[PDB]
Design a protein around this ligand. Structure first.
Ligand SMILES: NC(=O)c1ccc[n+]([C@@H]2O[C@H](COP(=O)([O-])OP(=O)(O)OC[C@H]3O[C@@H](n4cnc5c(N)ncnc54)[C@H](O)[C@@H]3O)[C@@H](O)[C@H]2O)c1
Ligand SMILES: [Zn+2]
Lengths: 263, 6
């Protein structure tokens, strides 16, 4: 328990200006404004077509290995998916020398697409696949995940060895990479601020990282349209805002940096 | 165990 206090964007810019090692922890909220709804019970969305108990779990993968591919294929094919202003904002915060890493539960790759340089993919990334017999790695790109691609023609996709391909994403019931976790833990151990943006922090991966940050007594700021499981438990502050409103923080800190003008 | 779970 902690008495989390609400603050403004300008107050957040103020906090960041003093920091030397800022880390972000991100969830589906940051891709919300990239046309992937975060609320999975939304009936007017892709998630309505698909049973999460199947496509989202490792049991579901072995029973119906086509489904998570169909899901990835449909989101990729049916929606326009570009970096939003949150991403550009996080990208400038690294440029200005504040943001040192983004630890993410998202598998869409948008942080890197915006130019972030140390994105730790705790749940993996939809642009890689592995044969779940021989462990061969195949690199994919957006054009390969389209419904019209040859790679998508037969699902699940098949490996020359005879095994099938599985996306390189961590499903519910699977175990997060212990070398990636250690990377995320050493980032938090060295940070002087953790931004927890667009996540409920109810998945073990997030909850445990936030616990770790309290253990190492790091200052924790939520940026989210809502309070969350860690409000009044783990975060010191909360900015009530959409991820994309982070351009205001980036604009403040960018303006202030332009003190390169002699005088 | 850093199992992904709700
Ligand atoms: N019952 C379940 O199967 C269940 C439960 C929890 C999480 N999950 C899934 O686990 C994964 C990890 O959890 P997560 O925390 O990333 O997703 P999540 O759904 O738990 O939460 C998304 C969070 O983002 C916030 N948000 C939404 N739009 C935003 C915006 N535009 N700007 C800023 N914040 C915004 C929401 O208020 C919420 O706190 C996700 O894929 C999620 O769907 C599933
Ligand atoms: Zn194989």
């Amino acid at each position: 328990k902690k008495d989390t206090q609400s603050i403004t964007l300008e107050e957040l810019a103020k906090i960041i200006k003093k920091c030397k090692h800022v880390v972000a922890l991100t969830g589906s909220g940051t891709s919300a404004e990239s046309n992937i709804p975060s609320f999975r019970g939304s009936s007017n969305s892709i998630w309505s077509k698909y049973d999460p108990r199947i496509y989202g779990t490792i049991w579901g993968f072995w029973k119906y290995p086509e489904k998570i591919w169909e899901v990835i294929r449909d989101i990729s094919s049916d929606y326009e998916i570009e970096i939003n202003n949150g991403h550009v904002a996080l990208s400038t915060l690294e440029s200005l020398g504040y943001l040192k890493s983004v630890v993410t539960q998202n598998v869409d790759g948008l942080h890197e697409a915006s130019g972030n340089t140390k994105v730790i993919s705790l749940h993996g990334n939809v642009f890689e696949a592995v044969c779940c017999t021989c462990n061969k790695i195949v690199k994919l790109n957006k054009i390969m995940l389209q419904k019209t691609s040859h790679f998508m023609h037969q699902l699940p996709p098949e490996c020359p060895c005879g095994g099938i391909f599985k996306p390189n994403i961590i499903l519910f019931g699977e175990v997060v990479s212990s070398d990636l976790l250690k990377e995320a833990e050493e980032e938090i151990a060295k940070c002087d601020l953790l931004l927890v943006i667009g996540t409920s922090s109810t998945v073990s991966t997030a909850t445990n990282l936030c616990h770790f940050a309290c253990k190492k007594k790091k200052k924790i700021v939520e940026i989210n349209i809502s309070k969350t499981y860690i409000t009044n438990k783990m975060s010191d502050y909360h900015v009530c805002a959409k991820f994309s409103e982070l351009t205001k923080v980036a604009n403040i800190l960018k303006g202030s940096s332009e003190k390169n003008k002699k005088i | 165990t850093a199992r992904k779970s709700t």
